[PDB]
Design a protein around this ligand. Structure first.
Ligand code: HEM
Ligand code: HEM
Ligand code: HEM
Ligand code: HEM
Ligand SMILES: [K+]
Ligand SMILES: [K+]
Ligand SMILES: [K+]
Lengths: 156, 156, 156, 156, 156, 156, 156, 156
């Protein structure tokens, strides 16, 4: 079913974002495991699977709309070098992502692609939850102290 | 455990190849699903996942060796336009990946990184099993014909 | 809860389309069975139950809004004479139904009937999935040939 | 994630409506239980639980958006003295609650808080379902007569 | 038990033929698996096992009759170039085998070795069941075409 | 994958050795059953099966490398006439076979066919385990006496 | 099976390193248990089991190659006086040990003792995994603080 | 608990005997497995585990009494070259171990360390159970003959 050209562009933009987040979060997860923060490495691993699942849904939507999913153009990974910076890097990406989700939803609505809007809104709900997690983690570092924070994520 | 700088470099080259394969195969899977060749899309999906797992091990070995895993630099996806092209592209990708795996194993031997060698060999075994799959599909397209081959991959 | 008059007109329009589809898809199903294409007959039967359930949800919503559901007016069925026409006729019908759905959703948002919009959106998502199936089937008749496509749909 | 000040004002306005509904439906339930109308009691109890669960989701969402949920300001409970009064009071409350949900959804949409909109639309759907229930009971009273309607709600 | 010298000789010829069949059918099996015709691969494998169990029974009997089993002399494998010739090569071999089997049986009856005879008839029956399978496949290639026959044996 | 001609010749040589072992162990197995040493017949039968499984793995590899497995050329069986000779015969062959296995691994490294090397190393470990069993069996005959060694192998 | 003199020399060297780790890690385990750091004691107890199983494999290999395992000679145990020093001592011992495994693997390849090489590579992998653990723990002691690190290992 | 200094010397002397017994019985065990006398090898393996378990109890006690357990000094293993010599080496070793245990118990009593005394008495009881096994095996060799004796420990 031929979709709106700019909807497909918006979708391919969100996909771009999901593709960065997949790589960024898989690396942070394997970093945290390598440092012995097993509980963070495991949580971050599932945040990366979630983004893979969003990508799958966006790729399927684009092919159905007779577009070309663009898995080639990979933007800037935000790699942290310590725990707080990695969580902050995850948050700065998710916030870039949700800005682009709002603009894409705005446009689906103008062109009446109500199903693409519903799909993006479900991704946006997932991303807002992840923002809530990340912001909470940066909160706890402050409330229990960095040493305690890292101590609480050594084991599962 | 600080490892050979060039072993890490080899590991990241193998990692870069895996990241292409992941995207290229995942894209091909969802194209075969879009066209209703669901037996092909399922099988290509699991090739995409197998490369996802090799990437996981490579990343873990790189971080253990105190290298920095490179997930930023995505090489060239080989995206086909029809079933015979998509299979042939995957095969070309796989043949380049096995050239690189062999060179990396040769280097692991020289510097005595026998465990990295063993990982790369397990991946190499897997990449050769995929090449057997691919060569065999292209062979079947000639033995039964393209129409019959697509027919047989319509349903699971 | 007295609903908006034009919303009720729009829901009755959608309902009229659903009623056509019910009958068109059920006849096509039964013709496919009569011809020995049982995979098609079975698939299309479920396609028409799904329309039946959509019509249930529209009938309930119209009565809740204190309108009178119109099951008396039945528009033109698009009945095909062979598997390729029958598939294309189904698609032509779904394409007219998504146009009406989008127009009914537009009005629902104008008058803040956000619950009716969400019901229509869920129907629209269903309709598009059907469109995906039909386009794909027609695409397969081209890729594998009609004789092979029909053969693949003789047996369950 | 700092949300929009008027979004939070609206959410808290929706929250305050739930907080009335909880108290009002919970008292009416205990009144019907006290009178021996156990089926009305048990059903109204579950309507209070439903509003309690809506209030939780609002509270959760207001805090994520970094506002302060307002559980201090309690508006006018509409307590009835007999079944007909109480059903009508419940229905007047829910008709107020839906007017306020529509105004807030209009505002979430204007600022692109699409997640807050979906949350409010989900509550809106539950409230309309309660309105069907209420209008229907008041309709049954006229059809079967007050003394028969009460009879049918004595037992569970 | 000291057996007849020419019975042992006949037995050891029958064993020679089983040994060709074992290797020939196993290589055809793995050949069909290399080509992706897993249904012929699976079936021809079980024919190889079946000839293995016959060879077992002939060795036990030869030794009980106090002769030396001959596993050293291996006749000519007829290895086929494609699916059709592999089936015809198996059939050629089985037809030679049935002939030796009937001479062996004739002689067994002459010297009153009725138990050897009964073992040989049991093998002969299995050989004729296999000849039926072989003739039947070759007929299916003429009836449905080579492309269709091969397609039907891609998937198990 | 066209493999190295010399690798394919090495594999075909290792296959020839396994083909000899299959027949040799199978005959020794069935002689020990004819003589009442069931525990030896049972153990040796499984040595025959394990060689058959090596044979299988090599055929699949040779075909994958686009060579032609040689099942036609059957070297000299070393059949013994009494228990100690049969054991010593089995041992002579396994020592011949490990030597060839080592020569082919050497050549698989020189040409970077690490997967083939891995398969041959697995076979080699198994053939070394058979050598331990054989040396040990012969050593036990020295320690307990041949009468006692055969007695200990009458029953399972 | 008479093995190479220098391979047996190398193998007895690995065993002697295993016997040191066995005792060192057991003692450290019982020290952590005595101080009430039961989680460290349990894990250290299991690393000591791990070295006990490698020693078993080395002993069995040496004896198969008709060497004499040397369980008499016992090198310097590196015993720490506190958690940080005990982990560092384990790490220094594991680093001496992987050096000797590498030299041993080198010599195994020279004389074509491919089975011994594969057993030592298996050990080498286990040692590296254990090295990753030790470095990770020292890193955590830095990043969470010693008191917090110890606290996390009081209980199981 | 500041333990008596001579108790702790005694305890480390019994520990040093245990450490010899561990390595000696383990070595004999793998020697008997390698010769195919699997029953002796299994029984000797468990004798080694039991001494490992005594050693662990001693280490804990020494640490409790605030001694430094001594795993560095390893005395003279008694390794035989055949079964009877091995059995008699174990018996010589156990006979030295129980003389040291009796001496350590005496001193424990004289200083009122009744808990250490009890631990030692339980080890002694087990050492006397091993002496009973050993003496009985040597007597069996005399009664049934070494050839029969060894025959009876060939299999499990
Ligand atoms: C650096 C790149 C990637 C890495 C390291 C990676 C890693 C993984 C891993 C480890 C798994 C779990 C497999 C298993 O244990 O069975 C997985 C699953 C999966 N991956 Fe990836 N992946 C990557 C990229 C992608 C991409 C590009 C996509 C799709 C566009 C994707 C889609 C999926 C999906 C759908 C699953 C299944 C998860 C589920 O349904 O539970 N991944 N990936
Ligand atoms: C206004 C028109 C119709 C409505 C609202 C309607 C509604 C429904 C619903 C809700 C179901 C049950 C779905 C479920 O399993 O949840 C159903 C079942 C079914 N309908 Fe319809 N339907 C309509 C017209 C038709 C027509 C025209 C036909 C055939 C010519 C038909 C044939 C069937 C059949 C065979 C079933 C299966 C029921 C069973 O086996 O239990 N329906 N319908
Ligand atoms: C090319 C030479 C041969 C090959 C490649 C081969 C292969 C095999 C394989 C793969 C199996 C199955 C093992 C499993 O269960 O995974 C098997 C079983 C067996 N083989 Fe062979 N074989 C060969 C020659 C022989 C010969 C010469 C004999 C006897 C004279 C024989 C007798 C048997 C028997 C009795 C079984 C057990 C069958 C059953 O009951 O399942 N094989 N063989
Ligand atoms: C040459 C030296 C040693 C060797 C070859 C050895 C070998 C083994 C083996 C193979 C096991 C069985 C573990 C399993 O398979 O799960 C074991 C268990 C064990 N070892 Fe040792 N070990 C040695 C020295 C020691 C020492 C010196 C100690 C104590 C100071 C010790 C303490 C233990 C304990 C407590 C167990 C568990 C026993 C049980 O409950 O089963 N080992 N050992
Ligand atoms: K066909
Ligand atoms: K703490
Ligand atoms: K005896």
């Amino acid at each position: 079913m031929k979709g709106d050209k700019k909807v497909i562009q918006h979708l391919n933009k969100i996909l771009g974002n999901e593709l960065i987040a997949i790589n960024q979060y898989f690396l942070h997860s394997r970093m945290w495991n390598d440092w012995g923060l097993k509980r963070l490495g495991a949580h971050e691993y599932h945040e990366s699977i979630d983004e893979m699942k969003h990508a799958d849904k966006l790729i399927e939507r684009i092919l159905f709309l007779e577009g070309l999913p663009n898995l080639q153009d990979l933007g800037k990974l935000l790699i942290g070098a310590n725990t707080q910076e990695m969580l902050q890097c995850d948050l700065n990406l998710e916030l870039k992502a949700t800005k682009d989700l709002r603009e894409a939803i705005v446009h689906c609505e103008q062109v009446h692609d109500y199903v693409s809007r519903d799909l993006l809104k479900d991704i946006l709900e997932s991303e807002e939850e992840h923002i809530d997690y990340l912001e909470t983690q940066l909160g706890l570092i402050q409330k229990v102290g960095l040493e305690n924070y890292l101590q609480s994520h050594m084991h599962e």
